[PDB]
Design a protein around this ligand. Sequence first.
Ligand SMILES: [Fe+3]
Length: 818
Amino acid sequence: KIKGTVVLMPKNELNLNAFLGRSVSLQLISATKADAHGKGKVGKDTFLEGINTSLPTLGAGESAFNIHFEWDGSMGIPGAFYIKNYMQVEFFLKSLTLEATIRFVCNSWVYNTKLYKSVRIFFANHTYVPSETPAPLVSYREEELKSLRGNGTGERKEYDRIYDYDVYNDLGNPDKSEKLARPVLGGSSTFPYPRRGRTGRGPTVTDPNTEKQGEVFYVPRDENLGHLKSKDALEIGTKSLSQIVQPAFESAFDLKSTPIEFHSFQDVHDLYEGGIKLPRDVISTIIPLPVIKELYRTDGQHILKFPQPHVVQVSQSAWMTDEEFAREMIAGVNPCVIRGLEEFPPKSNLDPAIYGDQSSKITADSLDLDGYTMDEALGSRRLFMLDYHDIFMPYVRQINQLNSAKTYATRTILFLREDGTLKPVAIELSLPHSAGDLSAAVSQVVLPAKEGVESTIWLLAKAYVIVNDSCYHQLMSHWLNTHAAMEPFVIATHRHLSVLHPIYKLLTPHYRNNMNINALARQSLINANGIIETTFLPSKYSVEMSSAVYKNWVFTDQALPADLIKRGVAIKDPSTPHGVRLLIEDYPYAADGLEIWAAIKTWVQEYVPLYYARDDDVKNDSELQHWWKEAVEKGHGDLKDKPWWPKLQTLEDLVEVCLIIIWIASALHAAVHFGQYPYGGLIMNRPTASRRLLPEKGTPEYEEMINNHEKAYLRTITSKLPTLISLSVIEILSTHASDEVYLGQRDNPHWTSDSKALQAFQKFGNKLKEIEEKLVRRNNDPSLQGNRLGPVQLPYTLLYPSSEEGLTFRGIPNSISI
Ligand SMILES: [Fe+3]
């Protein structure tokens, strides 16, 4: 008899005896002895015998069960097993351990046997490329993959484990209102877009191309992460905020129970100090909700108090400094858009026949480059820019036609001072111009000013820039480049790489909760009249703008070195450790990022060789080839015609592809995600919208700039209501769940039986700890204070590998998990 132990979690953990009797049966499958068809022999249905209470090591609401299998040596060595749950309620199977040791890491929900087309099968923790699969498991290996792919049809149900693709045609809500109709993103040259997980709810009544609404947006069952602690279900918070809290906030404003607008900057600071007083029933709607209740301190009656944002923890006014404005471009929430500027004036590739003369109005002689001439600044590579002119110009006219939205396509010129810090030297606020324009508003250039109305105009100019930046950051740097771009690879991986596959094991930890947060996002974050549309500048144009940007998305340019080189902030240099020399030496995001990038590169470079000896071995891996082909031709199908896609016929290519995927999912996402509330928790520092253009002299609006600059600023940026909603969502997002799995960690120490792979993973983890010590030394280095801390005195810790739970401003999760 083979002694076995089954560890599982009853549904109520997210009694024992109910699992005994004939409730749960398992059948071992042989990996060495096959029947007359080459398929591993199957043992007899074996039921759980009893509750085991021996080894202390057994937490997380887990329970262990004893079981003995009738298995003779003549049946070979078990390498897999079937399991059938005869109970009505599903349970979470953690693992099976056979002694005499064979391990099975399952971590999967097992629903009642009648709901499955085929019996749930689980494999032992061994790792095999297709050609190494023991012959008696080959068919079982391919059948499970076929099962995971489904047939492309049907409405997906909660227990389904079917991975497939579909376009973003589920954001609009045309059946509710024509105003909620949205273009389908993906599948057209007009709107290319990464694919998302297929749900199959069917067409809406008014539009066959739009998927009907659903109360629950399906994701393959095991992608929907349960949490032992409800406070850790952060992804569900977006839904509660949109469906329950937002309406409650709106009622307080409709009933005029709180001023509609912030009237001074102190009104904004009050949010995290004394707080904001709201109607009793409004507080009562919020205080009992899981996750939402953790967002604010309350007296339980009328007060909501937000946590003090990191950016104001030392100086509440430092965000207003030109120093901090520029520093956040290299160490802020969106540190990856700035580019080197090698010619002057900056040029535009936009059609002047459509937008009017696109020549920059910025004159070189007007800039203060600390004594440098323009030619000297250009040649010494000290000139940079945050360029949103070409990106935004195509949408300015339509955004500005909206009732409470007015923006400019902005461009900010930055000069790298001799002390190594960046200083903003001009901002161009551009507007498109065409015959027949009703508006008399014109483009203009604003220069730094510390006194008088000019200083107010310059402060407002910075605000229009950050509105451009916040939109680009949330929709492109964050949503498009991490969340959306990664989902196609998650789907392809489960569809074509067996759980036995080395690359599946290498990549899957980096997909944890990605499909889940994405599905919840399609439902409440990026949907018509969703959180983003109702809080950010572009309104109903928000998501389609990210499709326009995706036209220029390049997989290989996501690699950190390539990105730095492409943006002109670094140059290739073999004589350096990372192969690139930064043009801004103390560029926190880039410098810390290169360290993390290198650690991941080493790990992948050490792992791949363990399973692929030569290039031919990669070319001959059928699953790997089918995986990559599908990821590209279907997942990111609208760009399948591009030349830059790696071919994946070499070890080099496999390493590159895995390295980039891991980078995007871990460090890239953490860097653009966990600083949201730390930096944006003060709406003045990261405005999400602008509501009017600069005022004409001789108007009351112009007089206001002179007499009440704070009010002029507040009337221009995001209004108080959407601010409250936006602060709440980014507070939720910036929080690390206590059950997060960070880079250098895995959810199970037995994910593979291969000791060599396990040793390499341990080295990767040690290297990350080593890197963290180095980053701590950088933050403590006084010579780097200007860019790593700034006048806000906020140490750049976003790329520190580790973190405790909470809103910590540090820690790199393995995946896009929130
Ligand atoms: Fe995110």
